From a paper:
An [name] transporter is a critical component of the Mla pathway, which is a phospholipid transport system that is important for outer membrane (OM) integrity in many Gram-negative species, and has been implicated in the Maintenance of outer membrane Lipid Asymmetry. Here we report structures of the [name] complex, and present a model for how these two proteins may work together.
Moreover, in the MlaF1B1 structure, which crystallized in a different space group (P212121) from that of MlaF2B2 (P3221) with completely different crystal packing, the MlaF CTE is ordered and the terminal helix is bound to neighboring [name] monomers in a similar conformation. Indeed, when our MlaF1B1 and MlaF2B2 structures are superimposed on the catalytic subdomain, we observe a rotation of the helical subdomain by ~10 degrees. Perhaps as a consequence of this subdomain rotation, the Q-loop is displaced from its usual location near the site of catalysis, consistent with its role in linking the site of ATP hydrolysis in the catalytic subdomain to the helical subdomain.
Numbering used by the authors:
A (entry chain B): -4 to 97
B (entry chain A): 4 to 268
């Protein structure tokens, strides 16, 4: 159901079908979200990054793992509110279509 | 906040009996790309080592995010270095580790992050450089270009606030050269990393730089955009950029004050 986690630099919230992130998706601060990845992606069809200020490469890897675990459950996931720098980072690493929704 | 991540003021440097830099001053604006160019053997590598606090200047101040590096205590310098990454050409990979483990070493040493995520990160960074299929290979099994590219991939592993590249494009075919130029550009764009690039591959580095500085005769001879340099009549600047002496100015018609063109009156 509705899940809520907040920390100083990273917060996330699962309302129904949408997982929304807030703050910094950085290698030092992302660890809690990694630890609860399976709960965070349960019955979600959408990941909202509208309130995320920064995504480094480690955060992007976490994002790819979340998309993968979400679809394994049988759920194609949409991305929403993605800052253009995230797609620039995806472009840097030549990420395929099946790994990250464009 | 501070506008220039690196601010060199009146820096002089002498090695033995020969002078290397005479009262130079330059800035590295935060989040931008600064190119540093000049003839061979003038000590550009030495300049990067000066910024990194590895060498101390004879006189002058080197401000990193506002702090004078030569005046810093050793512990303060050690902690400030954590915001820096430097790619030297002399530096070599660990011979006992393969390409993958070489690029993963900085992450395993300072990232403290899960192994699956670390794995994905190292694979992405190998892809950015074109070495993903060479992860298992050892450094001895690598060609010059491949080894240089692997060193580069290790240098960008931790993505600090400041990355200094010493000739990142050498020993590469032109298509790989363009791939690497794209790498520095997109790194800077997506992560906001402040990049200093030393290169004699002048068109390539000027295609991405925000600011450029030319060094000659122990001083700074020019700076500005690519358009400004193409219209610079100075014989030393022209000799370096065109490679020939007493050639024509490529942008033959210099431009007036830009602020006046944009905002007349």
């Amino acid at each position: 159901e509705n899940l809520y986690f907040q920390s100083e630099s990273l917060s996330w919230m699962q309302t129904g079908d949408t997982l929304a992130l807030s703050g910094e998706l950085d290698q030092d601060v992302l660890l809690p979200l990694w630890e609860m990845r399976e709960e965070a992606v349960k019955g979600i069809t959408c990941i909202d990054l509208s309130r995320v200020s920064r995504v480094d490469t480690g955060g992007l890897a976490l994002l790819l793992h979340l998309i993968d675990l979400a679809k394994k459950q049988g759920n194609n996931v949409t991305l929403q509110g993605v800052n253009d720098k995230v797609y620039t980072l995806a472009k840097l690493y030549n990420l395929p279509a099946d790994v990250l929704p464009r | 906040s501070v506008a220039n991540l690196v601010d060199m003021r009146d820096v002089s440097f002498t090695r033995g009996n020969r002078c290397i830099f005479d009262n130079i001053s330059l800035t590295v604006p935060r989040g931008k790309i600064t190119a540093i160019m000049g003839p061979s053997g003038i000590g550009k590598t030495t300049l990067l080592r000066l910024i990194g606090g590895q060498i101390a200047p004879d006189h002058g101040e080197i401000l990193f995010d506002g702090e004078n590096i030569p005046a810093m205590s050793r512990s303060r310098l050690y902690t400030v270095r954590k915001r820096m990454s430097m790619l030297f050409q002399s530096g070599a990979l660990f011979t006992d580790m393969n390409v993958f483990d070489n690029v993963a070493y900085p992450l395993r040493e300072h990232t403290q992050l899960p192994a699956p995520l670390l794995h994905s990160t190292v694979m992405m960074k190998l892809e950015a450089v074109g070495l993903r299929g060479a992860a298992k290979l050892m450094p001895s099994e690598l060609s010059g270009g491949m080894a240089r590219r692997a060193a580069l991939a290790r240098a960008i592993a931790l993505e600090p606030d400041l990355i200094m590249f010493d000739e990142p494009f050498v020993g590469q075919d032109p298509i790989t050269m363009g791939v690497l130029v794209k790498l520095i550009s997109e790194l800077n764009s997506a992560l906001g990393v402040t990049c200093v690039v030393v290169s004699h591959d002048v068109p390539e580095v000027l295609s991405i730089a925000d600011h450029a500085w030319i060094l000659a005769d122990k001083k700074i001879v020019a700076h500005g955009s690519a358009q400004a340099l193409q219209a610079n009549p100075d014989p030393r600047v022209r000799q370096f950029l065109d490679g020939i002496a007493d050639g024509p100015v490529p942008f033959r018609y210099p431009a007036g004050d830009y602020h006046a063109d944009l905002l007349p009156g």
